[PDB]
Design a protein around this ligand. Sequence first.
Ligand SMILES: Nc1ncnc2c1ncn2[C@@H]1O[C@H](COP(=O)(O)OP(=O)(O)OP(=O)(O)O)[C@@H](O)[C@H]1O
Ligand SMILES: Nc1ncnc2c1ncn2[C@@H]1O[C@H](COP(=O)(O)OP(=O)(O)OP(=O)(O)O)[C@@H](O)[C@H]1O
Lengths: 262, 51, 87, 276, 280, 75, 87, 87
Amino acid sequence: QLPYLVANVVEVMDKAAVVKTSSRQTVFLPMVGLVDPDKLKPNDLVGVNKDSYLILDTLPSEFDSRVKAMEVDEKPTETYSDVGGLDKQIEELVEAIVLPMKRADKFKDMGIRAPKGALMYGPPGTGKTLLARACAAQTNATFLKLAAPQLVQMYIGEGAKLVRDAFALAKEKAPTIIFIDELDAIGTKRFDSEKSGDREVQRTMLELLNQLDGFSSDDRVKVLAATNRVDVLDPALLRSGRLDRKIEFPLPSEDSRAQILQ
Amino acid sequence: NDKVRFIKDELRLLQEPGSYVGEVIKIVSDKKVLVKVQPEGKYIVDVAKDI
Amino acid sequence: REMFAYAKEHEPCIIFMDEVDAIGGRRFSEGTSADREIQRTLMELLTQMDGFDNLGQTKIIMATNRPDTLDPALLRPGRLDRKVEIP
Amino acid sequence: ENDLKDIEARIKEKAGVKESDTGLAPSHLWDIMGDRQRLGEEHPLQVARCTKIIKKYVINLKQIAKFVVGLGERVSPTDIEEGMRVGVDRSKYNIELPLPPRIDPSVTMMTVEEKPDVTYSDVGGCKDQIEKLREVVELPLLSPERFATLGIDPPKGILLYGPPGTGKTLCARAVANRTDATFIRVIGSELVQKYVGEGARMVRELFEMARTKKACIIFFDEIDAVGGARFDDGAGGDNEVQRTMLELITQLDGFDPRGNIKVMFATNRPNTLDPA
Amino acid sequence: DTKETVYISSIALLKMLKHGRAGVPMEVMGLMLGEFVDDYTVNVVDVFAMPQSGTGVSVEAVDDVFQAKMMDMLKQTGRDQMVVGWYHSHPGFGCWLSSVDVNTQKSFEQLNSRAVAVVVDPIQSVKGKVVIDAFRLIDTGALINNQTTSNTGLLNKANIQALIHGLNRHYYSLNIDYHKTAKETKMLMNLHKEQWQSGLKMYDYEEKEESNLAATKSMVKIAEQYSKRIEEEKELTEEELKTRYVGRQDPKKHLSETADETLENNIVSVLTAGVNSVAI
Amino acid sequence: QIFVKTLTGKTITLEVESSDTIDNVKSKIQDKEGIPPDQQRLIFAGKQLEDGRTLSDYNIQKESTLHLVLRLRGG
Amino acid sequence: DKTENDIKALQSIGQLIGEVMKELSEEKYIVKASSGPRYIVGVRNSVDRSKLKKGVRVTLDITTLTIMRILPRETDPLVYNMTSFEQ
Amino acid sequence: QEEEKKQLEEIRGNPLSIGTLEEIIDDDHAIVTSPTMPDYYVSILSFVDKELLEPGCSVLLHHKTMSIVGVLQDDADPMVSVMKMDK
Ligand SMILES: Nc1ncnc2c1ncn2[C@@H]1O[C@H](COP(=O)(O)OP(=O)(O)OP(=O)(O)O)[C@@H](O)[C@H]1O
Ligand SMILES: Nc1ncnc2c1ncn2[C@@H]1O[C@H](COP(=O)(O)OP(=O)(O)OP(=O)(O)O)[C@@H](O)[C@H]1O
């Protein structure tokens, strides 16, 4: 029948079946040879009955409206001539982004350990969010956005599913770019506790990491981020491989002051 | 006989249902009060013959 | 415990396990019954390693950066007896 | 003397009790249409909102419980789309009815509708500072033909700071009188609820309704509560309120959800609040 | 229109439970066979099952022929007779009917004006208090137009919408009985007949003495506190000779309950031996 | 005319001919037994009478035998 | 044979998962489900009461709550993996 | 006392649950939120002073089915009702 629900697999004994349904109701389950069990893998969601939890029909990964929304037009209209100073930082940046999007052979012939993303630290007002309004324009690719607190939500499985969607959505629709504006929220440190509110926050971060270390430098995503702070956030993000290349956006020198006003 | 009465009375009503607990907020006009079940929300009620 | 039983019947064998400073959590920072995971997860560690008898077919290694942050409620006296810095 | 209380409460055991809730005198005979309206084709529904319409009709309940369902007489293909609030049976979960997006009460408890009385002629003769104030607020809404043609994009945000007793809130209740557009009286007490990531939800909806409307402006007050500084402590019990304000600053300056909405603040501690 | 016994054949019932329980949690529905009588004994004979899509709360009959292809397959043996009613099941929820039940029941009655529904609730149906019940709808048309005869017997005090709704539209709720005969009760009780070996099996002793000089150990401690419990017992009231001593393990009984017992199971152990001795 | 039986074993007989529309036939039991045909299921020898292939392609002779069936739903 | 296989499975409805605290008798054990409570249960004939001890993972029905089957080796190869050539 | 009070308890059950409402529609169609249950789409019985109620209010819900039946004056909080003077 039609009224049925969704679940997520975790294992296969030995045919066999196990699930973690959405209602927080695990089931061990004798073998369903209904669907070909070799036609699926763990975390591959499936339909399932309401009373006799058994696999009934697979189904796709349908993303949430609060994520598709973050797909973007090219409403940004800000050329690199609209920005002053920072000929370096933009020069350093684009040697991580479009060339791996287009001209990665100079890496791939060498096959060097490639970079995955970026970071733009420094104080308020050096042109952080602006520059991402620019790079989304000039490049002929898509682009994405999410403030960090747009992730955190009340319910105890509201966030992690959100983030596994985006990166998965970005492996789809590829090649893509990610923007995380105020990473200072989630990325602080380990706030050790057993309370609800202390866990559901960080457990998002634990997904973000596994998402970064899940793909490779072959599929053509390229993430970045931003912050007003670096003496506050967790170095696990800064570990070699995840977010390695950095940018110390300074204050502007006095020559740069002449450009900005003009 | 009064022995077998008890155990046959007692056993009759361990089959009986549970019984909740709660606290009073105020009293509505008559034969009507309100309660909050101390973990959960509100439930207007009626009362019995005695009280 | 499964990580040891599996390790037992495949004797001899070595263990390695990093980020070991995570078992502490609260480390009974308040003694509330909400961190039972952060407490017991140290317990089952200790009770099991005491069960080896130290015969010579199973040994264990651990590591971190902050041994001054370690939990010497155990793992100091006779369990992780030999401490070894590195240059 | 100790007999009075025996007699006094003896009255309490004489009258009884009395209470009401609601009712009506003239249309006293309501109760012929009720029962016929009750069991008919006016069952209740149990709301949700869709996520996908596969060529069936996945849903997600408020509480985390996701189904995949079909219809009765409601139109399947056409009227519905993604997103909206809906109607679902209580027994076997078919779709029957749409309904619009959510509009939280609180923000509509937060809009002002009746206009106060003061004016800039009732203020205490701080004649200059008002001129820096209104030049932000109303002239870019009444006489933009000056700011634009000469070539200046006006500002869209003020802040007020002075010692107390000085009339920071006065001049702000005033301008609502001379608004020529809406106004908001944000109650800072509703942004600090004790469920994580919630207050921030109230922030962004506060603006989704704004830019829906045309030319809204906003009056915070005592943002020293919310716009406090930041720090790192493994206790950090102000951890949560930091996550709220970030719903604000990311929303004020990034990727322009803003059109013409202005902002207004107030303080007695303008040093502590975060530079951002 | 009262005093209507509903006899049931014991071959019918236990088939109603088994298929009525094997499908648990999802509910289940089948049919009854029997025969009306003048007014009173609407008996029942035998039942069976229509195929069906069962849920925890709802079900229908998928196929519309397996009940028709089988009666015509039965009369070759003629082990039963025609149809008289239909049952269904509410697995843990109580015994009553619903707006779906009446819509289908309302067909049977106008089809045949004494047909019957039956309701069962196997989960709470323990080895004692079964809760089965049956029902015949009314004519509320005949109600607004607006019966006992010198006996009524039994009424319910539970199942709310079988107790406040159970009359205004549900049914003239109606008792049941059982046709337990001698010809079958003989073949019925043939389970508990233990065995002809099952009364001279002098089982092992290595628990016996381990119970004997274990039991006396458990006698004294209750005795010598009953030795305490007779100190004077005339203290401060006649009720104070009673209510200062709650019944928290009243001692004198507790020894007698084992005094007789250890006597009663040992006297068999000794007697059984000497009888077994003369097996040879 | 025609015969019709039941699951109870009762018989009803109708006055019809080879020109019969199932939407009209289904109304006939409603004429007599008072059944909405949604609760109906007619049979001819294992072949459920589909409402489309009207009886002209079913060899419904005179004095033929049918079987009526009621739908079953509960909850 | 396929279309006849699947129906042979659909009747075999699902189960529920738990874990043990301790043991009391072959007629009564204790469990701890994966959704909170700490039921008391019995046990079926087939499974060896020997293997049932503390720590084990367990499966049982939904209504009667009687334990039948066990699944060990809570595999998670992302967690650990052997190095046999290290021998 | 003969007709009014004889009818209300006929349709108002003995338990009348309590909740709130996030939004309303004319013609006896409305909404509820509440802790124990999820939201609902609900009708009205038209003797509540229908042009009274507002968002954030509190309500009197029939139990078997949900239905907005009446509304209370304040139901503000207990402790505020303590601090007042009676003596
Ligand atoms: N180097 C620059 N070139 C051009 N404009 C600049 C530059 N630096 C600052 N600006 C101006 O400042 C604004 C952009 O500031 P920016 O995006 O750096 O804020 P931010 O540091 O991102 O704030 P936060 O870090 O809190 O998000 C723009 O309005 C822009 O006109
Ligand atoms: N310039 C003024 N002319 C006339 N009255 C004034 C003036 N300034 C302050 N007041 C008086 O003070 C009150 C408001 O003072 P003000 O707006 O400074 O409060 P506030 O600074 O918002 O208080 P807080 O600092 O606690 O937020 C008014 O009710 C008014 O009576």
